[PDB]
Amino acid sequence: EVARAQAALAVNISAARGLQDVLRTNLGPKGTMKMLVSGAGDIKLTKDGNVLLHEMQIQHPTASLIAKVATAQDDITGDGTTSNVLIIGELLKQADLYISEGLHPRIITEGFEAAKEKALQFLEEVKVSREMDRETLIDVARTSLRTKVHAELADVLTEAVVDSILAIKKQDEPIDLFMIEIMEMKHKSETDTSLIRGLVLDHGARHPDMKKRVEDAYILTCNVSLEYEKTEVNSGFFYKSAEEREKLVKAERKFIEDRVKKIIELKRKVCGDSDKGFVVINQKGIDPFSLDALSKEGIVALRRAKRRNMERLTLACGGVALNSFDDLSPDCLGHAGLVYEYTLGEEKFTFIEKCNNPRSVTLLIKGPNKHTLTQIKDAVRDGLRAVKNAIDDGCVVPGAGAVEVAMAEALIKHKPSVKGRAQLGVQAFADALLIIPKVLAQNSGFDLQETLVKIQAEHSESGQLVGVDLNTGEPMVAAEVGVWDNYCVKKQLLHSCTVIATNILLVDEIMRAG
């Protein structure tokens, strides 16, 4: 089935609004949560632009296509997908108005670009270069989390955020694929958000009371089999050879009490005492009687580890990996100044913490363990990438539309071309910018018009960046307020908004066929 040109563009642009409109608070603290019980057919909770897209099975190509490119920003920033959709269809709103009056679909698409630049130039012009301190990042943390959750919820979150990235700023790595270690915990309340500069150990050893508080953590991350297995196992396993099974029964616990002694000696080599804590972590099962020997030596000897955890163990501690405990120097195992083996609920989740040279920082959250407990985890985690951009860009500008008008102003305040031709594109282009504050202000309050003429005249009067009180509808200096746009975030979605809006303006038919 087919729709041509004008009829093609409608289904495009018509599909945007309602879709787009649901997000009219996805951004800032005013952002309204949205629940899928319908996405796969499962009860959930989400606010993000790109995420909500993929979450819902989204039947319409319009809904379909941006989520692909909306994946880019959510890949990059993680938010502003919470935003970008809004300008996009409003932009789609603008171009048709010409073609509605009539105008060639080309030139409008054509007139967006110098517009896409002169506004992007204004980004260069407006971008506020800021020297990032934890506080600056605190308000960078809360501007993305307000977009996510309560500013209340943004609070306990903000700490671990700016603190986790705080130790990666040490690493001078502008991006974080580490200190992204996050933990969720059994609780009545998702309120708890915990920060472990080290790791947290999911698995407990089948033997409790081994070393329950490991003070000095000497961690050999060990694939080792200290359970080879205790009885008849041939290669370590059952088989069809009795002849081999007849030979292979005894060396098992021998190869084990080896690795027992290999730890026994190791412990006393690592320690010579049970005072200094000590840890063994098997990637596999361990004999508990091995443990029993070892649990009484001052070790916490752990088993069936997850190779992922082994890394941050091998790394954030500076831990190490062997197949034979042998003996290793006490220092030869990575370290965490304290280890706290911690049971909430019935499972001890061992905190290997202040892991020496942490490249990873663990963020625990205790919660009801619902998609509530999810709605918090996702919330911080894109703000992480957001605040990560503030590491990336030294330029962070405020949000809450403080940007938009002043940006939308110039190219409107003057035809950037002084072409009607481009201004056709531009007036279409430069207009859609205002969608964010004007709905949010009116989402929270009075009609856009006032705040608009406020924020404009204000910026016109100020040039200070003034932005909505996102639960009021009144403009406030958004820099000081702390609602803040990475020059990373806003610039990209800007591009993202326009770069899609063109060739999709250019779909002059669609056939259903393939």
Binding site: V22, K30, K34, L36, S38, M56
Partner: protein, 510 residues
């Protein structure tokens, strides 16, 4: 949507209109399901099993709703019940009531966050004057009437009639037997219904009550090494042959003979594994039993997983099928393991009671389980309404007296606060009358009579309603001064938990 697109069953009408009504109908059910009431609600199980309860979760669990609106919240009453006893039947209706004021505000056109916060704001304000509503506290958790005064409430909050001796027998069950200092056990306190006698005849046997038949000779010793087994005797014989009886004939006479001493072996190896009682999730084996009568091993012919559970639970037991000579893993816990007859049925009894391992197992006599069940519903709550795990519960007025107290208070503040925030904070203190309207029905009067006086009684922390004639004309009971009180705790929770969703459930238009 307009398009073919995405996934939502809420929003537009649904969010505003239909969710609120999805947020309505069941709260509407819970209204006389909570507090003093003569309301009763029949329910059939997946068993198709006819039963009546004013408890929600029972009703709730079998209710499916396309919306999350009704769906998601019920966890809170559970999240509540996770914490305490009833007040749960109050939790949702508190939300639903205060909710539908907002759709009115939506008619009045108030913004979500504008609607949202004033409650949350005043939700503090509730919790803020909520301690000012502490009119007493819990003195002796050992005392019966100290405790029975409370327990009557959640039972009342469940149902009006039977509350008293229940509140008595539950403290006569000795919630006393724990410190409840932070140490309290409803695994060591179990409600075990004997079908038989009366419910006034219902007792509480401290120590595990297993109505399951005590099989053969009683325990070897009272510190019972316990063998809890899902299938300890499945039979030791296999008869498959030429005829699966005889073809070469004497080959038959081997195994039916050779089977039983293997049951002896197992039973001797029950005596050999050392179990002072063996426990059969599967069947008893008679010869084995006879051997277990020789070896005097107490036995249970058949064991519910529920049995096996508590068995596996508290004993440290592990229910296992065994075609082998058995192995004690289960071992012991309970230091006295008995046979009782309550309702005159063999009661397998396990008591170690340490005040900490202390087992006080409510043993319900009654001629109907549905009886003893809707009972046990309120009885479920009273113990864990008693279970605050504050020995001092800061007893606050029972029955809902505290409601009107803050109706004046927080709407008087709701008055004082300005803006659209007002009705947010104002509707808040209006959320109380719902149940004073709800039970006023089953009481038999309009709520204005109730509330005008519940207002005109002004600050009391006593004067209140329920199912009563005192609840009819006077709009006065003693929901404090009569001995009906509430822990300070679930209040905070019944307040808070519902306020969260009512805020939250609207914000999602998806």
């Amino acid at each position: 949507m307009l398009k073919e697109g995405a996934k939502h069953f809420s929003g537009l009408e649904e969010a505003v209109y239909r969710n609120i009504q999805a947020c309505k109908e069941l709260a509407q059910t819970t209204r006389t399901a909570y507090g003093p009431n003569g309301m009763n609600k029949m329910v059939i199980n997946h068993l198709e099993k006819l039963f009546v309860t004013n408890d929600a979760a029972t009703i709730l669990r079998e209710l499916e709703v396309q919306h999350p609106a009704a769906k998601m919240i019920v966890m809170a009453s559970h999240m509540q019940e996770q914490e305490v006893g009833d007040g749960t039947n109050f939790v949702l209706v508190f939300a639903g009531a205060l909710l539908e004021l907002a759709e009115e505000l939506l008619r009045i056109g108030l913004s979500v966050s504008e609607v949202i916060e004033g409650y949350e704001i005043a939700c503090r304000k509730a919790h803020e004057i909520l301690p000012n509503l502490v009119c007493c506290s819990a003195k002796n958790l050992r005392d019966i009437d100290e405790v029975s005064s409370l327990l009557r409430t959640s039972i009342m909050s469940k149902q009006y009639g039977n509350e008293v001796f229940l509140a008595k027998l539950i403290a006569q069950a000795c919630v006393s037997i724990f410190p409840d200092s932070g140490h309290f056990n409803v695994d060591n306190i179990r409600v075990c219904k004997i079908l038989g006698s009366g419910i006034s005849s219902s007792s509480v046997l401290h120590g595990m009550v297993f109505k399951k038949e005590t099989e053969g000779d009683v325990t070897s010793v009272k510190d019972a090494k316990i063998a809890v087994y899902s299938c300890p005797f499945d039979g030791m014989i296999t008869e498959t042959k030429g005829t699966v009886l005889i073809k070469t004939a004497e080959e038959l006479m081997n195994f039916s003979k050779g089977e039983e001493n293997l049951m002896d072996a197992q039973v001797k190896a029950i005596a050999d594994t050392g179990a002072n009682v063996v426990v059969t999730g599967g069947k008893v084996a008679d010869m084995a039993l006879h051997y277990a009568n020789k070896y005097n091993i107490m036995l249970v012919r058949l064991n519910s997983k529920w049995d096996l559970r508590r068995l596996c639970k508290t004993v440290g037991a592990t229910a296992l099928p065994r075609l082998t000579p058995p192995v004690l893993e289960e071992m012991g816990h309970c230091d006295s393991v008995y046979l009782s007859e309550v309702g005159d049925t063999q009661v397998v009894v396990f008591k170690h009671e340490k005040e900490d391992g202390a087992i006080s197992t409510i043993v319900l006599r009654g001629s109907t389980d549905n009886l003893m069940d809707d009972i046990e519903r309120a009885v479920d709550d009273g113990v864990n309404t008693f279970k605050v795990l504050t020995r001092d519960k800061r007893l606050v007025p029972g029955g809902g007296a505290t409601e009107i107290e803050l109706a004046k208070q927080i709407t008087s503040y709701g008055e004082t606060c300005p803006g659209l925030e007002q009705y947010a904070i104002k509707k808040f203190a209006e959320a109380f009358e719902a149940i004073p309207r709800a039970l006023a029905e089953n009481s038999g009067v309009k709520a204005n009579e109730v509330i005008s006086k519940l207002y005109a009684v002004h600050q009391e922390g006593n004067k209140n309603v329920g199912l009563d004639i005192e609840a009819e004309v006077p709009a006065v009971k003693d929901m404090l001064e009569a001995g009906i009180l509430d822990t300070y705790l679930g209040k905070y929770w019944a307040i808070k938990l519902a306020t969260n969703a009512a805020v939250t459930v609207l914000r999602v238009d998806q």
